[PDB]
Design an enzyme around this catalytic site. Sequence first.
Site, PDB file in Angstrom:
ATOM      1  N   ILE A 108       0.902  -1.157   0.000  1.00 24.47           N
ATOM      2  CA  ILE A 108       0.000   0.000   0.000  1.00 24.47           C
ATOM      3  C   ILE A 108       0.943   1.210   0.000  1.00 24.47           C
ATOM      4  O   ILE A 108       1.997   1.200   0.624  1.00 24.47           O
ATOM      5  CB  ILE A 108      -1.036  -0.007   1.172  1.00 24.47           C
ATOM      6  CG1 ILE A 108      -1.973   1.177   1.061  1.00 24.47           C
ATOM      7  CG2 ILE A 108      -0.341  -0.090   2.640  1.00 24.47           C
ATOM      8  CD1 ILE A 108      -3.278   0.984   1.697  1.00 24.47           C
ATOM      9  N   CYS A 109       0.603   2.174  -0.831  1.00 28.88           N
ATOM     10  CA  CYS A 109       1.116   3.507  -0.745  1.00 28.88           C
ATOM     11  C   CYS A 109       2.584   3.538  -1.164  1.00 28.88           C
ATOM     12  O   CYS A 109       2.894   3.031  -2.204  1.00 28.88           O
ATOM     13  CB  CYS A 109       0.817   4.089   0.629  1.00 28.88           C
ATOM     14  SG  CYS A 109       1.202   5.924   0.772  1.00 28.88           S
ATOM     15  N   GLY A 110       3.491   4.077  -0.379  1.00 31.41           N
ATOM     16  CA  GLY A 110       4.901   4.102  -0.803  1.00 31.41           C
ATOM     17  C   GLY A 110       5.538   2.732  -0.934  1.00 31.41           C
ATOM     18  O   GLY A 110       6.543   2.615  -1.590  1.00 31.41           O
TER      19      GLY A 110
END
Lengths: 209, 208
Positions: A108-110
Amino acid sequence: QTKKAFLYVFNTMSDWEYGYLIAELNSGRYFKKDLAPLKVITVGANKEMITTMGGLRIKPDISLDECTLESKDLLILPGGTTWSEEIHQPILERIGQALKIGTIVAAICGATDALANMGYLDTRKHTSNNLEYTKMVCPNYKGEKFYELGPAVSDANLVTASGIAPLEFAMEVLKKIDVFTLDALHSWYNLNKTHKPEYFFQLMNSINK
Amino acid sequence: TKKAFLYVFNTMSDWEYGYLIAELNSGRYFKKDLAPLKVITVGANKEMITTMGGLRIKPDISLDECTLESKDLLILPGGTTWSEEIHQPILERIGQALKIGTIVAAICGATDALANMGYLDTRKHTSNNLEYTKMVCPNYKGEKFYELGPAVSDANLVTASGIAPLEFAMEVLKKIDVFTLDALHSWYNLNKTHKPEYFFQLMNSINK
């Protein structure tokens, strides 16, 4: 059938991004019938305590060394502000092998950008926070064709999501590992998203069946 | 100078405080004159706790080391454990904290704990479900002040259902006044809606 669930823990991990997923897994409270909780083992780069973005000091259960990733294990990778740092290189190498033996990896995300920069999203459907930023920030990324708007996308044994979409992220992981029935996952998703109470009565009567 | 505290205990529900504590502890969308509002974890004692999600957390301070002042923030997450006695000390201190003017922020099962100490009798509030609150909280007499929420801000008390961590975060964030009003509406709609243009507008108004 998934037997272990790992959450990679590191300084700066974004709290809002894994909370739904890990709570539902570790408790098993809305699992289907005859299915015990999927215990979440926290894994650190090493055994050192980490501090979340929210400031929580957490003691990793085990160190990356002590950890074995196996076909159908679950590995959760949260966002945080530190993923280019080179402390993460050993897990990022191991993720390559994990993906091969068939361990479900959920980024998720970075964490999505960590993976994009190792080549691993070059031929899998995926999303990220933003395509343009992922391209700028990931030189060895060649997966633009495979990129979708998401905010959560599932492909074989990889789930990627935007950081703003933790419920969707949790929903897709939950579905991939087949731990809820499809009724319980939809009503769970809808209750949390919509807050409409019909979904609480749905969910209570769909779980454990 | 004001502080932020999170009550940490076994069973605490990871998703309920997660947006709140990250926003505060990072300070990342705060008005530009405001430093991060560091989130001090406060346990019943100084022992390691496990979250519903399995995280082993080391409390910063014990409740006895904690001093709650006017306009400090205490965040009380939900969990499966709130009728246990371990929590009676914090539950007594929540009474004077509200008196002194500390901002107390209660979500989920924490809402029903405050109901059963009578703190929600004559104060606008919500909970997960009024009929469960009614059943499960024998000395709660607040039904007339109950609203569907799912988040309610009344003076120095914020309450929410566990199902609404974003609305919870948003109301607490508003109350303590740390974002511009525009940054907060955008952060909120960004998170609810996922439309990217809200992130551009958020970024354009953090110091409006």
